[PDB]
Amino acid sequence: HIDLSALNPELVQAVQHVVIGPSSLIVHFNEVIGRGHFGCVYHGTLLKKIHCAVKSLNRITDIGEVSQFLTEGIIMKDFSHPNVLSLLGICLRSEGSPLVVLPYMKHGDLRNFIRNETHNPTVKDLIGFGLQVAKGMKYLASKKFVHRDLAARNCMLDEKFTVKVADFGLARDMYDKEYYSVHNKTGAKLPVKWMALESLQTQKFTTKSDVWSFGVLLWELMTRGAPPYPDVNTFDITVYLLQGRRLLQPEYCPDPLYEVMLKCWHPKAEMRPSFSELVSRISAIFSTF
Numbered sequence: 001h002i003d004l005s006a007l008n009p010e011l012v013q014a015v016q017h018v019v020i021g022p023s024s025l026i027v028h029f030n031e032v033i034g035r036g037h038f039g040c041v042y043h044g045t046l047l048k049k050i051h052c053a054v055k056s057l058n059r060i061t062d063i064g065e066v067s068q069f070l071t072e073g074i075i076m077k078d079f080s081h082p083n084v085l086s087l088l089g090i091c092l093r094s095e096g097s098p099l100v101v102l103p104y105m106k107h108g109d110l111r112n113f114i115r116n117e118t119h120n121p122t123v124k125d126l127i128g129f130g131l132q133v134a135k136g137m138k139y140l141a142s143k144k145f146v147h148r149d150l151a152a153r154n155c156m157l158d159e160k161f162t163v164k165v166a167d168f169g170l171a172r173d174m175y176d177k178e179y180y181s182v183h184n185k186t187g188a189k190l191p192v193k194w195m196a197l198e199s200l201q202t203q204k205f206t207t208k209s210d211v212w213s214f215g216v217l218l219w220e221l222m223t224r225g226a227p228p229y230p231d232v233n234t235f236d237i238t239v240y241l242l243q244g245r246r247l248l249q250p251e252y253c254p255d256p257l258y259e260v261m262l263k264c265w266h267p268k269a270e271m272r273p274s275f276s277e278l279v280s281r282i283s284a285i286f287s288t289f
């Protein structure tokens with residue numbers, strides 16, 4: 001039982017902007033549509049019925065941890081962009097941690113979407129998805145929000161094939177445990193093969209380290225969801241990058257798009273493109289298709 005009186009009153013006020021009453025939400029706990037460390041995602045119906053995704057935080061039982069998670073993620077309610085996942089609300093109840101209610105993404109996560117062999121997305125399709133992500137990140141960057149876990153697995157596709165940058169704020173979790181490792185300076189699970197060289201060294205994340213991650217995501221897109229550096233152990237990712245080595249050009253990646261990838265992985269953060277610049281460059285490449 002999570003008591004609101006215990007939480008900081010400023011946090012309570014922010015949360016009360018988006019509260020959803022229990023009688024307004026039906027959750028199908030027998031229908032898992034995603035699995036996280038803090039809890040699973042379930043088919044839900046928000047009431048006029050709306051199909052939604054209900055993310056559980058029930059594995060978080062300590063009130064201090066719940067409070068911190070809400071604090072870090074509530075800013076989500078202040079964002080609005082076609083390429084950024086929105087928050088429908090938060091359901092507080094009598095037993096259990098708060099439920100995070102999110103728009104349902106009918107086509108699931110971007111990585112599994114492009115890996116699906118029946119889909120067989122074209123080069124044009126994939127660059128298009130990459131451009132959508134760039135626009136979403138341009139928006140987040142304009143709000144000075146640093147994502148810290150951008151990857152194809154963490155972007156979703158809705159019923160109209162609009163890509164939503166996801167897995168941030170109240171939706172944050174590890175949705176595929178295979179790609180998080182404790183072999184890093186923090187000793188906690190991190191997406192080390194998506195991280196900028198300087199984040200691995202200094203444990204700091206910036207919009208420019210998000211740009212690095214976006215480069216990796218572009219590589220994922222053009223390989224149709226191949227895992228990056230399959231032949232590099234998590235023990236070696238830092239020295240691999242220090243040696244100047246980088247992901248190789250995907251067979252079906254246009255030369256100019258690979259140049260963009262390489263720019264995202266420049267060892268000096270300040271030399272890497274802004275997301276504004278990425279949108280411009282990728283838009284031109286897309287238009288030639």
Ligand SMILES: N#Cc1ccc(-c2cnc3nnc(Cc4c[nH]c5ncccc45)n3n2)cc1
Pocket residue numbers: 033034035041053055085102103104105106108109112153154155156166167168171172175176
């Ligand atoms: N397999 C798989 C898989 C399932 C879910 C995600 C994922 C990645 N980032 C996220 N950010 N928020 C969510 C939850 C979510 C919102 N809407 C959804 N619609 C369907 C399935 C899950 C959701 N997610 N979910 C990634 C991989």
